[PDB]
Structure 1
Amino acid sequence: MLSGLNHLTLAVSQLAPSVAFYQQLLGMTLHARWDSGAYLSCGDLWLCLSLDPQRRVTPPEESDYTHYAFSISEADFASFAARLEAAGVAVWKLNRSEGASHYFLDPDGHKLELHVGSLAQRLAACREQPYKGMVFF
C-alpha cells in the first residue's frame, strides 16, 4: 500500500532565489543543485525544487488553500516566525484555525506554514474545540 510522502516537488520560476530561501532562510539541507533543479531535505522530507517556465509568482488571493506545513518545536516556533517576519517574508493567513501556526509565502507564492504539533495532538485539540460537523473515526 502507500506509506508516506516520498517527496514534495515545487515548481519554481528562478532556481537561485528558491534554493536560497529553502536552504539559507529556512535552514533545510542542500544535497545537490543542477541547471534545472535542486534536492534538499528537511528531516525525513525529500524536497525537490524544479525550474519550470510555467511557474508564475502567484499572489495568495489568486491561489487556493493548498499548502505545505513544516514541523517546528514549541521552543523554536516563535523566534523562527519572528525571524521570517523581520526578513520581510510575505504572509497569507493570520487566523490560527488549526493550532499554533505561522503562514508565509515562498518566492513564487507557494503557501507554506510552520506548525507545532502532530495529527494526534490536533485531533485531541479538536475533540474540545471541533470544527463544525466534526466526526472522529
Structure 2
Amino acid sequence: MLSGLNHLTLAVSQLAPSVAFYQQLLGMTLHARWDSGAYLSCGDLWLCLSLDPQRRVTPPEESDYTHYAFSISEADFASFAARLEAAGVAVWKLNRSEGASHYFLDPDGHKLELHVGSLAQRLAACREQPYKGMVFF
C-alpha cells in the first residue's frame, strides 16, 4: 500500500543556478550537495536535484501541463509572489483556474506553482462552481 510521496527528483542542466533558485530564492533547506546533485527539503518534502545532460530548457508553450505546486499561507502568498516577480522569474499559463495560485518557472523550465488551500478546500469550492462534467465520489 502506497502512503504518499517519498521524494520528487528534478533533472537540471546546471546544478549551481538550480540550487541557488530552490535555496536562496524559494527558501528551501539545503542538506547536501555533491558534484552531480543536491538534496533539499521543504517541510515534509524531500527534493532531489539531479544533474542531467539530457535536460533541455523548454519554453512553457511547448511543454505539457505537468507541474508541481507548493503550499503557502494566505498571509504570505501575495508578498512571496511579488518577490518572485521582482527577481525576474518567468511565468506560465494553465488552461483553467484552480483557486489562489501563482505560476512560475524554474531555470530549466520546470513548471512550478504557489497555491493556497488543501484538497478538501478545492473540493468544496468545486461543489459550488464545478468543472464541466464533474462527478464527486
Q: TM-score, normalised by structure 2?
A: 0.98
Identity over aligned pairs, percent: 100
How many angstroms does 1:59 deviate by?
0.6
CA contact (8 A) 1:94 1:102 kept: no
Aligned equivalents of 2:127 and 2:81: distance in 1?
27
Give deviations 1:52-73, integer Å, cap 9, x for gaps. 0000011101100000000000
Q: 1:95 to 1:83 in 2, by over 3 A?
A: farther
CA contact (8 A) 1:28 1:40 kept: yes
Aligned equivalents of 1:24 and 1:47: distance in 2?
15
Q: How many aligned residue pairs are there?
A: 137
Write out aligned runs for 1:8-27 (5 A): 8-27=8-27
Aligned equivalents of 1:62 and 1:90: distance in 2?
15
How many angstroms does 1:94 deviate by?
7.0
Aligned equivalents of 1:81 and 1:121: distance in 2?
21
CA contact (8 A) 2:92 2:104 kept: yes
Give deviations 1:3-53, integer Å, cap 9, x for gaps. 100000000000000000000000000000000000000000000000000
Aligned equivalents of 2:53 and 2:40: distance in 1?
21
Aligned equivalents of 1:93 and 1:29: distance in 2?
28
CA contact (8 A) 2:101 2:113 kept: yes
Structure 2 unpaired stretches of 5+: none
Q: 1:94 to 1:8 in 2, by over 3 A?
A: closer
Aligned equivalents of 2:44 and 2:80: distance in 1?
20
How many angstroms does 1:93 deviate by?
1.8
How many angstroms does 1:112 deviate by?
0.1
Aligned equivalents of 1:89 and 1:27: distance in 2?
15
Aligned equivalents of 1:10 and 1:105: distance in 2?
13
Q: TM-score, normalised by structure 1?
A: 0.98
Aligned equivalents of 1:6 and 1:43: distance in 2?
13
Q: Alignment RMSD, CA only? A: 1.0
